Amino acid sequence: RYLTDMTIEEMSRDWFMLMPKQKVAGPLCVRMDQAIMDKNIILKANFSVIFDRLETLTLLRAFTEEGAIVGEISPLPSLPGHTNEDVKNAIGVLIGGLEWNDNTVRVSETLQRFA
């Protein structure tokens, strides 16, 4: 059974790269901007769950309070599978990469139940 933190209108928005940084840490493509300084960042995401642990991912995105997209996580077509521990690795990656630029980062209440 699935979750919805993002509207399909907001699920489709593409975005630009200020200080583009992309990394593959597991079966995940993580996309980040470094030019953003000291601004509130909210993590919203839609995915599926199994035994209270994320089965699969659809999309993870970061907004400001004004509504600007910062970071993305996407599975790979070259690597489809992704067990929850790989997801946890991506989670830690995001927490670090965002608290580096001292950008305040909000976490929606769905995600922390699973990592």
Binding site: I50, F51, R53
Partner: protein, 339 residues
Amino acid sequence: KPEQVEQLKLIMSKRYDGSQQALDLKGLRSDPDLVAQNIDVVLNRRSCMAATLRIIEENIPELLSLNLSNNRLYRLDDMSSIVQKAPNLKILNLSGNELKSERELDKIKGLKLEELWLDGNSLCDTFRDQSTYISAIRERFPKLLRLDGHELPPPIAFDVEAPTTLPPCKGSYFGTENLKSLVLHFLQQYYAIYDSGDRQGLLDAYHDGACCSLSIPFISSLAEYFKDSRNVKKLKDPTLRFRLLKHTRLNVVAFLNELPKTQHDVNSFVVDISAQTSTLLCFSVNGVFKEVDGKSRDSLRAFTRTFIAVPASNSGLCIVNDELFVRNASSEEIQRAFA
């Protein structure tokens, strides 16, 4: 087919309890989760059960409770390999199944079970009473706490409180540093004269009426001591008892010169001051010596000597009774030669 397993994961997740980590498979045929899919799941065939095991083996092998009630479980010859896959499993329910023989139970006695359900299975009818059945369950699992929802009282356990620990074996006892320096000093003097070769210098350390006697154990290397070994356990003759006793300082040191000349390891002496009064001081000394004359100058001996001494003017001490126990040294006594 593996996609059968893929769809099995769904209903396994629907029946997973996250507060208690419990999985229920109670009567899978009823309550139309199986009927809403037209799939029957037989827990007797090895393929289906191994696939079900694998799902958790990938997902949650830390399960706490498992329910396999009412699933036509005739025999578990192939599920005995469950103990190693989910070892945190503590509660197991096998009620209303077809467990025919207790012969199966010896194949899974490696679990760590706390609650078990085995009622409804016909094998429980095979015991006349409940005590034979419960003791046969203790035969396989004593770790259990509740059976068939019934709280079992902890078993009969009378700890006699029998003590068998021996205290720590400490070394030389003196008590006062004064008695330490004193008795070590006296041992040194006496055993210095004793190894000089002319032991006659012991006349001033012994009493005018100081007795002396020798002993060795019963079984040789200790042949030369036989003439003066004195054991009242073996020797009954009273006049021979008196004649084997050494009485006057004269006769004592004369007899003491009869023994082969020695060299004692005093740095490895063990001193026990038994009683100190105003009028006497008894103490035993445990040690080793090597002979240096005769045929057994390569043979090494161990001894337990007992001294009783009265105080004497000018801070001295006069031996009144002397008992020498002499044995050959153990191997480890030989190894710890000198310090």
